[PDB]
Amino acid sequence: IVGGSDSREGAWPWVVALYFDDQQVCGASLVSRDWLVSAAHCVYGRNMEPSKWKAVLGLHMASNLTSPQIETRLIDQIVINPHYNKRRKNNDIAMMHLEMKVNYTDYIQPICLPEENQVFPPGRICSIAGWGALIYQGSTADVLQEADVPLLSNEKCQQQMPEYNITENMVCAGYEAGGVDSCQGDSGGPLMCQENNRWLLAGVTSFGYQCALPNRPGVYARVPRFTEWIQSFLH
């Protein structure tokens, strides 16, 4: 997360860290006691041996796994979205099952899933969170980073991202002048919008031209467009 600030313990109880061979590489969001929604390019080409993935919940400081509110789970199964296209960076989303259930605490909670036709209009301010790079090609964070970003219209995003095909399964966010954006190491992490006291999973950090650059919004997988596929796994 670039241009963000250090979040405190419990701020985002649904945000989870993912480790591949004990190496933190992506974020994901808890949506039940058993499943996590993350990005497909996180597990692409390394999804056949699921126990090689670790999900760390209730985490705060990446340099501190000793906190008593943390819980670790091995990944039982990884279900990449059937239409993921690495070349097109389209449908960058994936389900991950925790071998063992987690126990909901004040530091571990599921994020609400948006309605299928939940509208996220431009100007709408939302939040991104992750332990990724603090600047492009820079070092990742320790304290979980958080940031607020305004959503764009796909029309406007396609505009600033001519080198890509902004599909209806994507949603973008970011400032015209740049400064705040999701970066490497944040993929799989959420893009959340509070809808009346409740936080909804709007997007899934997917891709974008570098990070925090002006008129170069971060692209996310538009969750409302996958809300049914996701809820089918629920249990």
């Binding site: 313990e9 419990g10 701020a11 985002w12 530091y107 909670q109 609400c112 909804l200």
Partner: peptide
């Protein structure tokens, strides 16, 4: 669901 629980 979607609620922060820390003061």
């Amino acid at each position: 669901c979607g609620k922060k629980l820390v003061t």
